[PDB]
């Protein structure tokens with residue numbers, strides 16, 4: 001990233017909901033990004049389910065995921081959310097955010113390869129300690145909104161250290177809104193409600209293509225009650241609607 005510039009006009013969307021959080025928005029490239037909070041833009045948080053993006057790429061690159069038509073079969077044993085109790089494609093597993101599919105991917109990738117790829121991707125603090133199947137859920141890995149937009153820009157441009165076909169496969173799995181005039185790729189996350197005096201984090205990260213332009217975005221907020229979870233999309237959506245990007 002080049003520079004990060006404060007835009008105070010976005011604060012109103014946070015204060016109206018009593019949300020402590022940050023939005024980072026970059027037109028064309030991470031050369032120039034805007035944010036409501038310079039300090040929070042670079043503060044690092046657990047990635048939670050946003051980690052499915054690098055994890056999917058690493059799974060493909062290592063051959064743990066064979067291709068985009070692989071079916072991750074459900075063994076019929078209880079999973080923590082009922083929407084995960086079914087056979088899933090890669091896109092299906094990302095869209096329903098099926099943690100156990102990605103835990104098994106991570107186990108098969110292994111610590112050595114996982115560390116190597118997070119270094120190649122400059123992914124956050126690159127700290128995978130805490131258990132190979134949970135470091136991004138409750139371990140020591142942390143990433144900022146700025147770093148998310150840098151990582152997503154590389155993915156958009158096919159510039160990550162991975163094959164172009166594998167980056168294209170994961171990008172297809174990340175489409176969340178299609179209109180004739182714009183296309184959104186994105187991923188949500190929610191670490192949990194945290195503990196006393198130590199809130200969890202909620203995320204929405206991605207990019208928007210409109211006309212011949214591209215906008216990279218990353219939102220996070222502190223959260224201690226799950227009723228507030230939809231704000232992770234509604235606050236940044238309102239900002240991007242106000243900017244004329246979506247809608």
Ligand SMILES: *C(=O)N1C[C@H](NOS(=O)(=O)O)CC[C@H]1C(N)=O
Pocket residue numbers: 047048049050096097098099137187188189190191
């Ligand atoms: C990811 O953050 N997780 C898996 C699943 N994600 O759905 S979300 O992206 O809509 O928040 C549920 C929340 C969370 C988890 N419990 O691990």
Ligand code: NA
Pocket residue numbers: 188229230231232233
């Ligand atoms: Na939501």
